[PDB]
Every structure is written in C-alpha cells, then in structure tokens.
Amino acid sequence: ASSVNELENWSKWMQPIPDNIPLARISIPGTHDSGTFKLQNPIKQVWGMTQEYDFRYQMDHGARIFDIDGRLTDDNTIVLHHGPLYLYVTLHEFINEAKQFLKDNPSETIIMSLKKEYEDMKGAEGSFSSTFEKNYFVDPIFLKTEGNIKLGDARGKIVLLKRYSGSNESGGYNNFYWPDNETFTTTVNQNVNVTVQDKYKVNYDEKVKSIKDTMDETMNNSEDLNHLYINFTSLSSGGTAWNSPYYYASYINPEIANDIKQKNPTRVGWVIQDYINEKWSPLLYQEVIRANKSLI
Amino acid sequence: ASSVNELENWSKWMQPIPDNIPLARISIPGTHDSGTFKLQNPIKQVWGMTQEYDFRYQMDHGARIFDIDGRLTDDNTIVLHHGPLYLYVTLHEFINEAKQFLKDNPSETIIMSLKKEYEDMKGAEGSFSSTFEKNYFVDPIFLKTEGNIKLGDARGKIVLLKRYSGSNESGGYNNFYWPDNETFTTTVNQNVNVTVQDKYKVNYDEKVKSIKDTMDETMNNSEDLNHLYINFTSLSSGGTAWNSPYYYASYINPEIANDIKQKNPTRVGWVIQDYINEKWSPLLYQEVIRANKSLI
Numbered sequence: 290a291s292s293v294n295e296l297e298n299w300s301k302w303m304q305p306i307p308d309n310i311p312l313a314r315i316s317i318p319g320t321h322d323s324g325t326f327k328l329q330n331p332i333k334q335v336w337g338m339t340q341e342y343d344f345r346y347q348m349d350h351g352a353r354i355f356d357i358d359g360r361l362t363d364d365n366t367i368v369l370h371h372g373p374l375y376l377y378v379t380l381h382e383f384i385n386e387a388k389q390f391l392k393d394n395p396s397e398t399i400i401m402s403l404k405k406e407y408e409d410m411k412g413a414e415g416s417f418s419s420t421f422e423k424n425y426f427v428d429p430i431f432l433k434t435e436g437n438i439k440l441g442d443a444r445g446k447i448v449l450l451k452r453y454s455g456s457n458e459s460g461g462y463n464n465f466y467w468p469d470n471e472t473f474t475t476t477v478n479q480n481v482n483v484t485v486q487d488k489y490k491v492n493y494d495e496k497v498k499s500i501k502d503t504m505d506e507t508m509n510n511s512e513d514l515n516h517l518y519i520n521f522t523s524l525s526s527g528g529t530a531w532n533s534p535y536y537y538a539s540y541i542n543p544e545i546a547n548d549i550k551q552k553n554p555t556r557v558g559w560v561i562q563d564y565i566n567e568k569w570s571p572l573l574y575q576e577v578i579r580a581n582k583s584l585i
Numbered sequence: 586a587s588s589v590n591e592l593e594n595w596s597k598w599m600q601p602i603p604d605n606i607p608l609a610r611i612s613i614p615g616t617h618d619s620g621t622f623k624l625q626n627p628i629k630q631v632w633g634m635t636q637e638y639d640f641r642y643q644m645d646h647g648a649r650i651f652d653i654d655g656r657l658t659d660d661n662t663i664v665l666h667h668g669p670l671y672l673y674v675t676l677h678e679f680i681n682e683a684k685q686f687l688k689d690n691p692s693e694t695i696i697m698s699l700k701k702e703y704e705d706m707k708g709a710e711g712s713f714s715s716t717f718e719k720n721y722f723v724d725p726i727f728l729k730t731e732g733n734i735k736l737g738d739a740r741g742k743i744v745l746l747k748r749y750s751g752s753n754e755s756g757g758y759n760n761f762y763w764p765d766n767e768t769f770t771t772t773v774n775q776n777v778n779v780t781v782q783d784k785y786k787v788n789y790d791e792k793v794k795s796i797k798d799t800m801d802e803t804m805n806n807s808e809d810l811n812h813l814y815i816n817f818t819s820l821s822s823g824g825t826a827w828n829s830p831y832y833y834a835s836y837i838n839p840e841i842a843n844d845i846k847q848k849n850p851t852r853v854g855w856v857i858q859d860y861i862n863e864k865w866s867p868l869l870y871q872e873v874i875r876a877n878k879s880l881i
C-alpha cells in the first residue's frame with residue numbers, strides 16, 4: 290500500500306515511503322527534550338519542560354526522532370535529566386515504549402538521539418558509553434550498521450544518533466563535533482554529512498530567521514540524499530516570565546507550519562520541536578510529514 | 586586458534602601471535618606502579634595511587650607488563666612500596682597471582698620489572714639483589730634465558746626486566762642505565778635496543794606530545810624487530826586532586842586510545858598506563874592489543 294493519503298495515518302506515515310530512500314532525505318518530525326512531560330512544579334516547568342505528553346502520544350502524533358538526555362547512575366543504569374533536574378523517566382522506559390510502538394507499527398522506525406546530560410554518579414565503574422553499549426545497545430532492536438542509513442534497514446528498529454564520546458560498538462549515526470548554540474556543517478561518516486541549526490538562547494527574531502534560513506537550504510538542496518539537515522525549532526527559557534519554551538512554541542510552531550503549508554516544499558529536514566500537541570492550529574509535525582508526498 | 590578475533594579475549598590475546606615473534610615487536614599494555622591498588626587514605630591516594638584494581642583484574646583486562654617496586658625487609662622478604670609508602674602487598678603475592686594466571690592461561694607470558702624503591706630495613710641480612718635472586722628468581726617460573734626474547738620461550742613464564750644493580754643470575758632483560766625524566770635510546774644486550782619515553786614531571790601538553798612522538802616513531806618502525814619501545818602514559822602527582830595521577834589519566838588514557846583508533850597502526854609499543862579500568866570511554870589497553878592484528 291503506497292498512496293498519498295497514507296501519510297495521513299500519523300502512527301504509520303513511513304509505510305508508503307520507498308525502502309531505498311536514505312532516512313537523511315525524509316522530512317521527519319522530532320521532539321526536543323522528549324522526556325520532560327512528567328515535570329509538575331511550575332518553577333521546574335517554566336525552565337525545563339518541553340513536552341506535555343508521553344512518548345507513545347508523541348509517536349502516535351508522527352514524531353520519529355527523540356531527543357534523549359541521560360545521566361549514568363551508580364547502578365549501571367541511565368536515567369533521563371534536563372540539566373540538574375531528574376525527569377521521572379529512565380532510558381529503559383523510553384526503549385520499552387519505542388519497542389511497543391514498533392511492534393504495533395512495523396513499517397516505522399524510531400531515531401533515538403542519546404546525549405550525556407549530567408556528570409556520572411560517583412559510584413559508577415563504567416563510562417556512560419560502555420554502560421549504554423553493554424547494557425542497552427546490545428538488544429537486537431538497535432540497528433548496528435551505518436553509512437547513509439536507508440529506511441528499509443531501519444523499519445522495525447531503533448536507529449541511534451550518538452551524541453556521546455567514546456563509542457566502541459558500530460551502529461547508527463556516529464558522534465560528530467557539535468558546537469554550542471550555532472548552525473554548523475560537518476561530517477558524520479564516510480557517506481554522510483550534516484547541517485544542524487541549534488541556536489537555543491538567541492532572541493525570538495534571530496531564531497525564526499535561523500529556522501527559515503536552514504529550511505531554505507534544505508529545500509534548495511532537495512536531491513542531496515546523503516546530507517542530513519537537523520533543524521531545532523525549540524528555544525530555551527527566559528525563566529520566570531513570558532519567555533518559557535511553552536510561550537515560544539505557541540508562536541514558533543504554527544508560524545513555521547504555515548510557512549511550510551503555503552510553500553508546499555519537497556523537503557524540510559528533521560524538524561525537532563517543543564510541545565507536540567493538537568493545540569496550535571497549523572500543525573508543524575503534520576506539515577513536515579506532508580512534505581514527503583513527492584517521495585511516494 | 587589462529588585468527589585476529591582471538592585478540593578480543595583478553596585473558597588469552599597472546600595465543601594467536603606467532604611464537605617466533607620477539608616480545609619487543611609485540612604491542613603490549615603494561616600497568617605503571619602496579620601494586621598501588623590497596624591504598625585507602627585520601628592524602629596517600631592523591632600522591633601515590635596509580636591503579637584501583639588488583640593484579641588479576643589487570644591481567645584479565647589484557648595487561649602483560651607489571652611495574653614492581655620493592656623494599657628488602659627485616660625478615661629478608663621483598664614488599665612493595667611507592668617511595669616511602671608501604672603498599673599492602675608483597676613480591677610473593679604478585680608472583681603467586683602471576684603463576685595462577687599463567688596456569689589458567691598457558692599461552693600468555695607475564696613481564697615483570699623489578700626496582701629497588703626504598704633503602705633496606707636496617708635489620709636485614711644481605712642485599713636486595715642477592716635476596717631477590719636467591720629466594721625468588723630461582724623458581725623455574727622465571728625465564729633464565731636472554732637475547733631478543735621470543736614469545737615462544739616466554740609462554741607460561743615470567744620475563745624479568747631487571748631495574749636493579751648487582752645481578753648475578755642470567756635471565757630476562759639486563760639492567761640498563763635509564764636517565765631520569767627524559768626520552769632516550771640505548772642497548773639492552775647484544776641482540777636488542779630500547780627507546781624509552783618516561784617524562785614524569787613535565788607539563789600536560791609536552792607529555793601528550795612526547796607520548797605521540799614516540800608512538801609515531803614506533804608505528805613508522807614496524808619492521809624493526811631488534812628494537813623495544815617503552816612508552817609511559819603516566820604522569821606524577823602535583824599534590825592534587827585536579828593534578829592527580831587519576832586526574833591526568835582520565836584525560837590521557839582515552840585521548841591516546843582514540844589517537845590509536847583513528848590511526849589504525851600496525852605497532853604502538855609497550856604502553857605503560859595508570860588506572861587500567863573500564864571508567865574512561867575508548868580503552869587504551871584494548872587499542873594497543875588490537876594493534877597486533879598485523880602479526881596474526
């Protein structure tokens with residue numbers, strides 16, 4: 290079954306996309322700081338909450354990229370954090386949720402970005418990477434091949450986007466440089482390069498221009514099949530005020546979504562957003578999925 | 586039996602290397618001040634601890650060279666010291682650990698340096714050298730032959746690297762001069778030369794560059810079967826923490842490990858490191874063993 294109306298099933302939108310196309314080329318909705326949805330204290334919320342619904346909701350709304358920040362415990366486990374804040378979620382919980390979704394929707398893949406967010410607990414004998422790789426990554430749900438990863442190889446599996454140093458097991462997208470608060474271009478592996486727009490902590494107007502600038506580059510470069518474009522629409526908190534990630538997203542999400550809706554581009558990139566919800570109308574993740582109609 | 590995968594064991598990694606290869610040609614992880622793992626006092630650890638796990642752990646993580654420093658006691662026994670610090674370990678204990686490992690893994694060899702670390706306890710009978718050679722070295726676990734020692738003669742035995750004066754018994758590698766805090770080249774016996782890099786007490790940048798320079802040379806001189814390369818990654822203590830052996834090691838170990846990973850050399854030498862452990866993230870000892878692929 291390969292038809293344009295199939296992009297409309299948000300829990301199965303990758304089904305009609307040809308198996309031979311690189312993940313890089315697909316336009317894919319992502320969630321920024323995916324595991325922050327359990328946070329309750331409004332002071333903790335205004336500073337570090339980026340999502341209000343759990344992993345399965347994010348996935349059934351079309352998100353296929355997950356921004357997972359981890360801290361290594363004294364127990365050979367990894368739990369999720371946002372800066373110093375313990376989220377109330379462990380890495381194993383994320384992986385179980387992803388496995389359950391992939392079992393229900395085996396046409397899909399889940400891309401998991403994994404970053405060391407906070408310093409290791411004092412009793413930990415292993416490194417963040419040996420501990421992840423020995424205790425979690427060994428599961429056959431994780432794709433262990435590399436190059437310019439294709440959709441066909443990814444279906445039914447989790448594809449790692451490594452953001453931690455010292456990996457010793459092949460698989461997914463290699464760790465690459467990653468300067469703070471910039472738009473940058475580098476190499477991922479022999480077959481892949483990457484441009485990332487990740488200017489968190491600029492003012493609203495610079496943010497919106499940066500999102501659009503990088504989106505223009507990816508539209509104008511729609512046939513560059515081994516070039517990843519990762520575009521974060523999320524902006525960090527001004528704290529106590531009218532400048533929370535929530536407040537920014539309530540304007541940024543529908544603005545970028547309308548731009549896409551109106552331009553009807555053939556490629557928009559991996560667009561990683563705060564607050565996936567059905568609240569603000571032109572829906573960003575929907576418009577992003579719809580930019581794949583030229584691949585069917 | 587006979588493939589490069591057998592380098593992954595690492596209780597048995599010497600097994601696939603041909604017997605007629607001189608030990609000098611093999612790339613071999615060693616541990617610096619091997620006996621210091623029992624130290625508990627924080628002041629003492631800061632100044633004098635270089636390892637945190639026992640001898641068998643070291644061997645089971647691939648170390649085959651051991652830096653033993655001893656002191657002759659009241660009872661004509663040799664106990665291990667780090668300068669004035671009594672460690673809580675004797676020569677007999679190291680030798681018995683080595684025997685058990687070699688019984689369990691008879692394809693391997695253990696190379697042991699012995700040095701006089703502190704003056705004899707005044708109550709003691711002869712000299713350090715005469716007590717060692719008469720009470721310990723006479724055991725047939727110690728190889729008594731010399732020249733450019735081959736792996737085939739070394740298997741199932743201890744190969745001594747003599748760092749004491751006054752030797753009266755043949756076997757292993759002769760004492761040779763050894764200028765302080767320098768990298769230098771000399772002769773060991775009629776059949777072997779040595780380059781040693783042992784700049785303890787130099788700034789971090791000069792240390793990292795000295796390590797690489799010596800390693801660059803050894804990887805360029807891969808067919809030089811006549812020539813031993815001993816490269817110490819260890820740096821001495823500043824009063825610490827923040828300039829501990831542990832502190833320096835946390836950065837040096839993974840940095841050199843990654844340098845080797847990236848360069849894929851066919852020879853890197855006898856690499857003697859602080860803190861053999863699983864704490865930091867690409868593993869120095871593993872990357873040195875892996876550099877033996879060309880020999881198989």
Ligand SMILES: [Ca+2]
Pocket residue numbers: 322356358371
């Ligand atoms: Ca984060």
Ligand SMILES: [Ca+2]
Pocket residue numbers: 513514515516
């Ligand atoms: Ca390209």
Ligand SMILES: [Ca+2]
Pocket residue numbers: 618652654
């Ligand atoms: Ca010593």
Ligand SMILES: [Ca+2]
Pocket residue numbers: 778809811812
């Ligand atoms: Ca030579």
